[PDB]
């Protein structure tokens, strides 16, 4: 029931929550845009990011555990669950202006959840925490059991 976490390598993490598994990646790659995708202003908006209701509370807990402040921090971005491409929930943690303090807080949240956490964010460049639910096209082949078995 309660979530369990693991670190595959320097950019790949996973969370198991209930019957669902989530790919968590930290990188300088983003495919979402505020112009087109869903801004998650309050936790209830996470429902627009995920089909299954059961998978929503784990992401809500994860965001809290990272230190995200729903009242004061910038909104997360996610792909609308109605789209073909699959779940993609994104924290902007760039070591740049307007996200420098936020980014360090979220990274410290990652260090508290994964002891082996590696910071790949270069100063003055974009950096993201990306969540995809295993089984959506957006998780590609990274949730095959050849990957998950190495984590646990």
């Amino acid at each position: 029931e309660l979530p369990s976490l693991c670190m595959l390598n320097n950019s790949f993490y996973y969370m198991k929550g209930g019957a669902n598994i989530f790919l968590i990646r930290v990188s300088d790659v983003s495919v979402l845009m505020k112009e087109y995708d869903v801004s998650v202003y309050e936790p209830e908006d996470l429902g627009n990011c995920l089909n299954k209701s059961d998978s929503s509370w784990a992401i809500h807990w994860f965001s809290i555990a990272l230190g995200h402040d729903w009242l004061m921090d910038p909104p997360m971005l996610c792909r609308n669950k109605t789209k073909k491409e699959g779940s993609n929930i994104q924290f902007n943690i760039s070591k740049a202006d307007e996200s420098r303090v936020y980014g360090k807080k979220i990274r410290n949240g990652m260090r508290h959840l994964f002891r082996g956490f590696y910071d790949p964010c270069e100063e003055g460049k974009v950096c993201y925490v990306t969540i995809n639910q295993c089984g959506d096209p957006s998780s590609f082949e990274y949730c095959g059991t050849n990957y998950l078995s190495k984590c646990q």
Partner: antibody
């Protein structure tokens, strides 16, 4: 390498017949983008026919082209197809395939060169 | 509701090299800045110039710019060049069915 959409050659078809034209894609993940189709006749602007998502075979049609147009796709050859039924002279036109960006933004970021259909006896 | 009708009230215009021109596009419903501009060359090749009202695609000259909101939109070409001879089409991406304006043909005065 770069994205390319290669459409099949011009077709001459008798009224009442059917024809299937194709759009061969290269340079990107064919299963991860919508392929849209567009009809151009002179002085008739551009008309959106419909779209297919080769990832799951799902289709959406402009109601004006339902039954007229049938969209299919073959992931193994990265090819999208448009089949016309019961052709008439109003179907004489240039037809474009065009892909949407990753994430479905309803802009067409790469276009085929067009296929000219002539319906005539 | 009904399909969104896209109207380019000017079907053709002509201007001198270096002139500034603007091409109007209006929609019959609020399209919330989901408005894209295409350039079709005389040989029929189509290129996306601008998406989301004003976002220039990579490689597109900065002479091209887009403005608008709600129902009313505009493509502006400054410092018109020989290579800009083409027909320009607007397109709404708010909702299906996707719909296009009828096109505005641009020719050079000499």
């Amino acid at each position: 390498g770069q994205v390319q959409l290669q459409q099949s050659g011009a077709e001459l078809v008798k009224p009442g017949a059917s024809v299937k034209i194709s759009c061969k894609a290269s340079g990107y993940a064919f299963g991860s983008h919508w392929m849209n189709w567009v009809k151009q006749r002179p002085g008739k602007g551009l008309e959106w026919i419909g779209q297919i998502y080769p990832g799951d075979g799902d289709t959406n049609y402009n109601g004006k082209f339902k039954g007229k147009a049938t969209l299919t796709a073959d992931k193994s050859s990265s090819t999208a197809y448009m089949q016309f039924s019961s052709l008439t002279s109003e179907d004489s036109a240039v037809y474009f395939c065009a892909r949407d960006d990753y994430g479905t933004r309803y802009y067409f970021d790469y276009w085929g060169q067009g296929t000219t259909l002539t319906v005539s006896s | 509701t009904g399909d969104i009708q896209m109207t380019q009230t000017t079907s053709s215009l002509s201007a001198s090299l270096g002139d500034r021109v603007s091409i109007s596009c209006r929609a019959s419903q609020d399209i919330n800045n989901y408005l894209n501009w295409y350039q079709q060359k005389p040989d029929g090749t189509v290129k996306l110039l601008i998406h989301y009202t004003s976002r220039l695609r990579s490689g597109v000259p900065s002479r091209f710019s887009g403005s608008g909101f709600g129902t009313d939109y505009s493509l502006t070409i400054t410092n018109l060049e020989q290579e800009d001879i083409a027909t320009y089409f607007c397109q709404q991406g708010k909702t299906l069915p996707l719909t296009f304006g009828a096109g505005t043909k641009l020719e050079i005065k000499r």
